[PDB]
């Protein structure tokens, strides 16, 4: 009396492979095994045999026995065991008793078993042929640090794909199928993408890690980068000359420190000098640049000795008129005061900002305040 | 696929639920005759309603013509046989004003008490349910039997059972074995 595996076979449904030390079995007498969430009692549907090679391996055709004798392994077809965990003691009840008790013995081996499945986690979904491989796959993905949410067995249908589609709004790249050695209908593959899973079927088991991981690294590196733009990387600029004063403003700057970007907020500080004001505006941002004839992205630390020409747009407020408000001798800086550091962090990327930097965000602030 | 076995939902229900004047009327009916449910009052209501509808069909038709006379007579012959309708009121029109009290005072419940035997009404139902009272040569054990008027002459205790002959004790079987030792 021992269960070995929980295979999903055609015709019978959820079968159970047993290994029998000593005893008798006949096609009719009920058993009392163990479910993950239910003490089961049920009849024998049928009883198979290999005749006389393999247990399962690949192909599927069996003999039919009315009664069998120990000691040998055998598949038992039966009813009301859609969940029925491996390693249970398959007891029998002929004329007497409501047995159980072994329920509590072997349900302690089930409670501390499949704890990796985060019941309300964040993806993905696993589907296996047998329950033995399903336990090993969860423990494999446990150490590689991929979160695992829901679990099932057998072939995948369209109802089992929406199973893991609560994460279409959140991630959205954390809602995929990791199918272990089982087929799909279509139907199912004609619902997958579509909208917008998608399936990764493999029959080894570190493919269906490598295929997932290679896919995952594409769209996490299309998030960071790109930011690029929005994230303002600070800078310092020596104003050498003035090309065109206004409409639009073109300034022959020279980069001392830090990186520049198409979309770096600029602020040339009138050095207070008492009130710590300036006040925070030099219109733009910078749409275009020019190293002689070439627009670039961008100059850091000091790539070119020749002076680079700026090109500032006109978004918010009055532009400081050149000569009156600001002049050639003022050093131009970035806009960074406080809320650029909201964009700082964005964990996992890292880098940028690289480990030589920054270092200048100890300097900032102040600077301004 | 032989013959769908035909059944009939006999006993029905009132139209309004919480009509307080009706509730008091139905309670005193249960208080007198010791009925368990409201269903046993509705038992008469439906079965009595069928007899009224049959009378309304036969009355509106012309007299001294076939069905009216033949069907209406068989209806009256039945109601005087069972003992609900009296012998001096075989006119069809009297069947319309029968009322529920005549049916409820023509059962194996009430007739056992009025003979004697049980005493205190509720005791009679307990005697009927516990395999006493053989009307013919066979033990009846339904309260809603409806006695046939002619058959009321034979209502006695059974030959077997307590108050009969054979069966002695149950509770006295304790006192038979125990008192024999002393």
């Amino acid at each position: 009396a021992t269960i070995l595996e929980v295979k999903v076979v055609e015709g019978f449904g959820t079968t159970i492979d047993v290994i029998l030390s000593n005893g008798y079995l006949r096609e009719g007498d009920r058993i009392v095994l163990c479910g993950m969430n239910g003490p089961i009692v049920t009849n024998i549907r049928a009883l198979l045999t290999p005749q006389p090679l393999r247990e399962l391996r690949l192909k599927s055709e069996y003999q039919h026995h009315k009664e069998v004798k120990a000691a040998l392994g055998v598949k038992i077809a039966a009813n009301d065991l859609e969940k029925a965990v491996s390693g249970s003691r398959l007891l029998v009840v002929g004329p007497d008793d409501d047995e159980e008790e072994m329920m509590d013995d072997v349900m302690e081996d089930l409670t501390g078993l499949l704890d990796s499945v985060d019941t309300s986690g964040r993806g993905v979904v696993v589907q296996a042929s047998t329950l033995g491989s399903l336990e090993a796959l969860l423990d494999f993905l446990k150490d590689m640090k991929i979160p695992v949410m829901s679990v099932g067995l057998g072939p995948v249908y369209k109802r089992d794909i929406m199973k893991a589609c609560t994460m279409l709004e959140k991630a959205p790249e954390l809602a995929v199928m990791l199918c272990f050695d089982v087929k799909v209908d279509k139907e199912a593959e004609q619902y997958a993408a579509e909208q917008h899973i998608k399936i990764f079927n493999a029959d080894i088991i570190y493919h269906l890690f490598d295929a997932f991981t290679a896919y995952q690294k594409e769209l996490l590196e299309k998030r960071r980068a790109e930011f690029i733009g929005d994230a303002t990387f600070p800078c310092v600029l020596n104003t050498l000359q003035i090309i065109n004063k206004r409409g639009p403003m073109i300034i022959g700057v020279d980069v001392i420190e830090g990186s520049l970007k198409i979309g770096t907020p600029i602020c040339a500080v009138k050095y207070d000098p008492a009130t710590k004001e300036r006040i925070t505006l030099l219109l733009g941002r910078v749409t275009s640049l020019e190293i002689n004839h070439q627009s670039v992205t961008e100059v850091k630390k000091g790539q070119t000795n020749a002076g680079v020409a700026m090109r500032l747009e006109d978004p918010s407020g009055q532009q400081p008129i050149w000569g009156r408000h600001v002049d050639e001798k003022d050093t131009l800086y970035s806009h960074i005061t406080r809320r650029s550091i909201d964009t700082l962090k964005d964990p996992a990327f890292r880098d940028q900002v690289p480990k030589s930097d920054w270092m200048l965000i100890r300097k900032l602030k102040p600077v301004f305040g | 696929p032989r013959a769908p076995r035909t059944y009939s939902k006999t006993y029905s229900t009132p139209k309004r639920p919480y009509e307080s004047a009706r509730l008091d009327a139905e309670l005193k009916l249960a208080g007198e005759y010791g009925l368990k449910n409201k269903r046993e009052i509705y038992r008469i209501s439906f079965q009595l309603s069928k007899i009224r509808r049959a009378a309304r069909d036969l009355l509106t038709r012309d007299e001294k013509d076939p069905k009216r006379l033949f069907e209406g007579n068989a209806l009256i012959r039945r109601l005087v046989r069972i003992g609900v309708l009296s012998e001096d009121k075989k006119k069809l029109d009297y069947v319309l004003a029968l009322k529920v009290e005549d049916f409820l005072e023509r059962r194996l419940q009430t007739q056992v008490y009025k003979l004697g035997l049980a005493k205190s009404v509720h005791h009679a139902r307990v005697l009927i349910s516990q395999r006493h009272i053989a009307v013919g040569k066979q033990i009846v054990n339904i309260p809603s039997f409806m006695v046939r008027l002619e058959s009321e002459k034979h209502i006695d205790f059974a030959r077997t059972s307590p108050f009969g002959g054979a069966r002695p004790g149950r509770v006295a079987r304790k006192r038979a074995a125990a008192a024999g030792g002393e």
Partner: protein, 143 residues
């Protein structure tokens, strides 16, 4: 006074055809014949339907009173459309959980809003083979 309508012995045709036109000015007849229950009414013209929970939203009640009502956003299985259901009793949404199958039902108004809730036309009943009556009255727990 001839009462408008034709009172002829051979009027038959006009009496029948006049009423098949006037029958269209009744909501229950119009919706049965045209069949907006199949083509609309989020469900498939049915009593109950299951779905999966997406998020848990707190909805504000209307004017004279003032309170937050507690609701759940659900994706239906058979249709694929999304709705906003209601969770009854004190607490109760603690047992409902996120990312779980939930069986929905009507409110008892033939569509329409119920009481004081703006645009909430469904009610939560069961959560994975156990009703909220059973869980709220601690008699058997969730699986």
């Amino acid at each position: 006074m001839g009462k408008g309508k034709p009172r002829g012995l051979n009027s038959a045709r006009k009496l029948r055809v006049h009423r098949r036109n006037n029958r269209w000015a009744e909501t229950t007849y119009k919706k049965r014949l045209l069949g907006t229950a199949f083509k609309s009414s989020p469900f498939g013209g049915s009593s109950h339907a299951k779905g999966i929970v997406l998020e848990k939203i707190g909805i504000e009640s209307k004017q004279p009173n003032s309170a937050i009502r507690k609701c759940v956003r659900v994706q239906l299985i058979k249709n694929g459309k999304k709705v906003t259901a209601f969770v009854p009793n004190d607490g109760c949404l603690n047992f409902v959980d996120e990312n779980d199958e939930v069986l929905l039902a009507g409110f008892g108004r033939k569509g329409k809003a119920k009481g004081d809730i703006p645009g909430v036309r469904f009610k939560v009943v069961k959560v994975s083979g156990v009703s909220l009556l059973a869980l709220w009255k601690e008699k058997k727990e969730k699986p």
